[PDB]
Amino acid sequence: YYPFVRKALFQLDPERAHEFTFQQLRRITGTPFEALVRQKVPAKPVNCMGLTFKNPLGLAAGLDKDGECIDALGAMGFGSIEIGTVTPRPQPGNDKPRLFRLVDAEGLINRMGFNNLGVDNLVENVKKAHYDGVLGINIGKNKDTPVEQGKDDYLICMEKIYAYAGYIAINISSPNTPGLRTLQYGEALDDLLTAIKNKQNDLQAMHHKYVPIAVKIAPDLSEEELIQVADSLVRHNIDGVIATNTTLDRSLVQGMKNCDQTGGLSGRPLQLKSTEIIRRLSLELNGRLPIIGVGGIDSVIAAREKIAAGASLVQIYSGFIFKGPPLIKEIVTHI
């Protein structure tokens, strides 16, 4: 029963509880000791972006920033695991405390700031993994890098991970990297997607391997902004879109502790917004490219809601914290 584990883990600070949880998972990942966390789940393959996904449920990015527990996490059922976000150089991200739990809303607020050990380190961890699901590597801009030259940060990363990644996630949706979201808009975006799509072709010829590229978008786009983003992805033949990241919105959590904290809200208070975004995106993309729906998913029905709204795959993070491994099994089994 996870509810008893969660009471205990919740007595610890959000980030401290994470550090502790992963300390443990790191001592067992890729060893027979992952029997402690293994959960059998039905096969439920899905073709998406030219890959076969073991099953439609994925671990959204942010949990295993550095790719330390891929094997252990896969043992829990995930048909895909998105590691990252990594950056070319390591950085510690924003200042603690930067992670807060809205328990009664089953949501999380975070201004982490791309806290990662960098891309070289991630690649070394990924070489130790033996995960038969699809591995996505999420990549981002270094804080100090000027947003005008952010492409350089993304292309460096692509070169080092291309040979080890199932799919690559372009993160331009973090509200905790100053100015980063602007990379979703206008000519900035068009500029970046051309860099990326060019490197991809290069790297395909270099490595003789086909790797899809997916852009992760924020949920706080306007209707016009979303129309422009959808048009852009289609025009640059981006293989997929991850919708969505965390939100600056707070309309559903007023009067709750840590409501006023700065950062991105996730979990149940993002569920509806995230579904709306996907539905409008689906209507715009009209089947021209797949959507990976993440945002507030915390039950079979909610997962299926994102499927009905247009998504070909779903990803979980906050609901994984609040409902634990059992959610993995519910969803894969019944989606």
Ligand X SMILES: CCCCCC/C=C/Cc1[nH]c2ccccc2c(=O)c1C
Q: Encoding tokens for residue 152? A: 């350089």
Cβ(41)–Cβ(332) below 8 Å: yes
Picked from ligand FMN, ligand X, its own copies, none, the partner binding residue 9 (CB below 5 to 8 A depending on kind) is ligand X
Q: Encoding tokens for residue 321? A: 């914290």
Catalytic residues: 174
Residue number closest to ligand FMN, CB atom: 62
- Per CB under 6 A, 85 contacts ligand ORO: yes
- Per CB under 8 A, 252 contacts its own copies: yes
Chain centroid to Cα 316, Å, comes to 8
Q: What are the start-end ranges of the E strands in the chain?
A: 46-48, 51-53, 57-59, 80-86, 99-102, 107-110, 134-139, 167-171, 213-217, 240-243, 264-267, 291-294, 313-316
Residue ranges in 62-101 that form contacts with ligand X under rule CB under 6 A: 99, 101
* Least distance between its own copies and beta carbon 101 (Å): 14
Q: Is beta strand 51-53 parallel, antiparallel or unpaired with respect to 46-48?
A: antiparallel
Binding mask 201-240 for its own copies (x = CB under 8 A): ----------------------------------------
Q: Encoding tokens for residue 98? A: 């930067």
Q: Encoding tokens for residue 5? A: 């584990």
Picked from its own copies, ligand ORO, ligand FMN, none, the partner binding residue 104 (CB below 5 to 8 A depending on kind) is its own copies
- Per CB under 6 A, 246 contacts ligand ORO: yes
Residues making up the annotated binding site for substrate are 65, 110-114, 171, 176, 245-246
One-letter amino acid at 327 equals L
**Tokens 């550095």 sit on residue:** 66
Residues making up the annotated binding site for FMN are 61-65, 85, 138, 171, 216, 244, 267, 296, 317-318
- State the residues that interact with ligand X by CB under 6 A: 5, 9-10, 14, 17-18, 21, 37, 99, 101, 108, 320-321, 324-325
